[PDB]
Amino acid sequence: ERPSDLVVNRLVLFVVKGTATSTHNTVKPLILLEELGVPHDIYVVEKVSAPWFSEINPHKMVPAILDRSPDGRDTLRAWESTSTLMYIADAYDKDGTFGGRNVQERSEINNWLTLHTAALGPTAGYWLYFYKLHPEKLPKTIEKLRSNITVQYDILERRLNEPGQQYLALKDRPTIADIATLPFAMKSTAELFGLEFEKWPKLQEWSVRMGEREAVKRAWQRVAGFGHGEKEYGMLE
Amino acid sequence: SERPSDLVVNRLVLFVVKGTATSTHNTVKPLILLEELGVPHDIYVVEKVSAPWFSEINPHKMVPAILDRSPDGRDTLRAWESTSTLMYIADAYDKDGTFGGRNVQERSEINNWLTLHTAALGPTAGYWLYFYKLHPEKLPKTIEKLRSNITVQYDILERRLNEPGQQYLALKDRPTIADIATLPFAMKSTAELFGLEFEKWPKLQEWSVRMGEREAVKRAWQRVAGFGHGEKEYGMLE
Numbered sequence: 001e002r003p004s005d006l007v008v009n010r011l012v013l014f015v016v017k018g019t020a021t022s023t024h025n026t027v028k029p030l031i032l033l034e035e036l037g038v039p040h041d042i043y044v045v046e047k048v049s050a051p052w053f054s055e056i057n058p059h060k061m062v063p064a065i066l067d068r069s070p071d072g073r074d075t076l077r078a079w080e081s082t083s084t085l086m087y088i089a090d091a092y093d094k095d096g097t098f099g100g101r102n103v104q105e106r107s108e109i110n111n112w113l114t115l116h117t118a119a120l121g122p123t124a125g126y127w128l129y130f131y132k133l134h135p136e137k138l139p140k141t142i143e144k145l146r147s148n149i150t151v152q153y154d155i156l157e158r159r160l161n162e163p164g165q166q167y168l169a170l171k172d173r174p175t176i177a178d179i180a181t182l183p184f185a186m187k188s189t190a191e192l193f194g195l196e197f198e199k200w201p202k203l204q205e206w207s208v209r210m211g212e213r214e215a216v217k218r219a220w221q222r223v224a225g226f227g228h229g230e231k232e233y234g235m236l237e
Numbered sequence: 238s239e240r241p242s243d244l245v246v247n248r249l250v251l252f253v254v255k256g257t258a259t260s261t262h263n264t265v266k267p268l269i270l271l272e273e274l275g276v277p278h279d280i281y282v283v284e285k286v287s288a289p290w291f292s293e294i295n296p297h298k299m300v301p302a303i304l305d306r307s308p309d310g311r312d313t314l315r316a317w318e319s320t321s322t323l324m325y326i327a328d329a330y331d332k333d334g335t336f337g338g339r340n341v342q343e344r345s346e347i348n349n350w351l352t353l354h355t356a357a358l359g360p361t362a363g364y365w366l367y368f369y370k371l372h373p374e375k376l377p378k379t380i381e382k383l384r385s386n387i388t389v390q391y392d393i394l395e396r397r398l399n400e401p402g403q404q405y406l407a408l409k410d411r412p413t414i415a416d417i418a419t420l421p422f423a424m425k426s427t428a429e430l431f432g433l434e435f436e437k438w439p440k441l442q443e444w445s446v447r448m449g450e451r452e453a454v455k456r457a458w459q460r461v462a463g464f465g466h467g468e469k470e471y472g473m474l475e
Contacts, residue, residue, distance in 0.1 A: 077346075
């Protein structure tokens with residue numbers, strides 16, 4: 001079965017009702033969609049648990065993307081934020097502006113993108129679970145995860161301190177790697193972790209440089225408002 | 238912080254450590270693909286991942302890592318994080334898209350299941366092994382929760398493999414970098430280390446034995462166990 005209003009004519013990004021702690025992963029694909037000007041629709045999921053949604057993403061989370069295939073005969077699906085970034089970059093960044101133009105560029109883009117996906121992303125994800133969602137409070141665990149977040153921030157700082165290394169993967173311009181990292185490496189998010197983000201200056205400078213991009217501003221502005229517009233759930237107009 | 242005398246990049250150099258039961262689950266992943274594609278490569282057994290010269294190669298101070306020559310051969314590039322190593326090898330040495338994916342459709346599913354493993358099972362297992370063995374104190378209330386999350390992942394993989402003709406995680410027809418990335422953390426030996434009955438997920442076990450029958454996978458497990466236990470313990474192997 002399926003919902004009535006769910007129809008794919010363009011890329012379809014699945015999000016939830018905007019909050020502080022529900023947007024840090026959904027904003028990632030939205031930043032890239034805003035950077036490339038890809039035509040897309042927003043579908044606000046009421047219950048990620050809903051059986052129809054688990055057929056789209058078996059991990060039962062946002063973001064998730066349903067899109068028609070290149071030919072336009074069949075539809076494609078992408079889930080896990082890092083997997084949404086790659087799929088867009090594959091299908092919409094033909095110039096490799098954000099995906100990488102050759103093997104050498106991609107090699108560094110996949111390094112920093114994957115580092116985030118495997119280290120800082122899960123570490124931050126587990127931290128938020130044990131802090132807010134876990135029925136019991138385990139402060140020894142929450143402390144060890146907060147300790148691991150600083151180890152990651154350190155690795156980002158070290159990289160951004162290297163000569164002319166303005167962005168994480170490439171010196172010259174931002175890549176999906178930078179988009180994947182920004183939501184878990186900004187002053188707002190550091191403060192939530194109970195960290196002084198000034199301690200990592202170059203990582204703070206980097207976050208501000210990224211934050212001043214019009215596409216990043218629009219993404220944060222829009223992702224906050226989803227589910228608080230004229231339509232509470234389903235396909236937004 | 239000198240780069241060791243014997244460290245030279247004439248071809249793809251895969252960085253590993255001394256082979257154990259604990260030290261081959263991530264370093265086997267790029268080695269499986271290298272064996273599957275028959276890529277010419279060297280093995281460099283790192284004595285100390287803490288060594289400052291190694292931190293210049295992989296700032297996360299872990300294996301696997303890769304130094305390789307650029308396509309033209311004039312420049313030197315690096316790959317670190319097991320999932321990053323697979324994606325690089327596929328990009329540089331899998332032009333047919335046999336494991337990397339041939340078109341957008343195939344890659345979409347390959348990236349999905351690859352990323353799931355990279356973001357969910359991989360980091361969950363890695364945190365589980367840490368608190369169990371490496372963390373000075375043992376906190377039972379936390380460690381149980383990670384084991385409880387490993388099962389939720391095993392359940393998602395079982396649901397996928399139960400779909401009609403879904404012989405492999407990403408694609409129906411053949412194995413991809415997604416399957417190579419998941420295997421080490423979804424096999425009977427690794428399920429028993431987690432204190433789980435791997436029979437409870439039949440199709441996932443069927444998948445795990447079928448992947449083990451592949452000659453490239455057998456060669457990888459064989460070789461990765463033997464690194465550092467040969468005549469040369471550390472440095473570039475021959």
